[PDB]
Amino acid sequence: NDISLIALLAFSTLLPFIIASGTCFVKFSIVFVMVRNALGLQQIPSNMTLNGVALLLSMFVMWPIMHDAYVYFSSLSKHVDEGLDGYRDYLIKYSDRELVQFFENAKDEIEKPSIFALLPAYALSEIKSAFKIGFYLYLPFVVVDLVVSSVLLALGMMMMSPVTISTPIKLVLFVALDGWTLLSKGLILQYMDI
Template identity: 60%
Template sequence: MSNSISLIAILSLFTLLPFIIASGTYFIKFSIVFVIVRNALGLQQVPSNMTLNGVALLLSMFVMMPVGKEIYYNSQNENLSFNNVASVVNFVETGMSGYKSYLIKYSEPELVNFFEKIQKVNSSEDNEEIFDDDNISIFSLLPAYALSEIKSAFIIGFYIYLPFVVVDLVISSVSVNVRYDDDESGNHIYTDKINFVCRDGRLDNVIKRTHFTIF
């Protein structure tokens, strides 16, 4: 019976693992930013979604490695047993302190308090209290962290997108002046956007190249 319970717990953990990785790590930020950059370049299929997700996953593993190591060492020291419910609950509350600290660090306090109040709205506790880091539930931190990372990713994507908008405007205005058709103008835009990336985002080089190419 105990082996069956342990097997069910392990299978449940592995079932939830992809969702935790997608929404509870840096993967959510990397994946959004990469898609925004691809759209800014005007490339719909290059790199492919699998490539972008693979790179985002590798970078997320690198960033989250210290947190993962701490969780692993805590599980070894506390003798985590999936046969004992109390052991699992204790590990989530104490053994994952490093991951919990990570979530607190990168979550907006307003969102954390919002989800914590919603979670305790039906309890007898005072909902107006200011929650301490030690008392915050990890189930309140996860949605707060996900929304915070999405907001942060869109802010980063906005600043990355702006230079490519400038490139579009420059190429479009020059193309109108020399009366290029839409196909030629589009080819120049794609070429100069890629050139913009290859030159580490130096807009002056793109403008010079455009000037010499057209004139």
């Protein structure tokens, strides 16, 4: 099996290239750090457990996709395209149709597009949607950062950093709202219905 350990180690360095780009781990891990930076934390919790919760949530929508390829899959030319047809009818849903024509030129029912033509547009569409839903989270905290900074300025204490006061209020506004479970419910219901 020395001809196969290279086929195992290259697969073990190929899945970090695919899971980090072409799955929903991209949209998952970005919002967890944007809500980490919205409260005003640097080292809490870590960079490691936030990729752990996002990886466990990432396989909740990918394990129904991966099971279709395991049952189905020079005869290996047309063997791969139907093993990935369950992955390529998912990539047309969350990408831009005009953008995949930009990569296909440089109907869709009668011919699905090429698999290497829409994976960059899927990655750019999830980075854009993560930046959009990441801007929304910042706003409530910014309001409670401007209120305490203008209440201390209503008094004469201009030499007082409000980071020592705003950090208690920002994480009771996230736990009286039940914030961490609320973001994960909307992230699951945006892909798999209940």
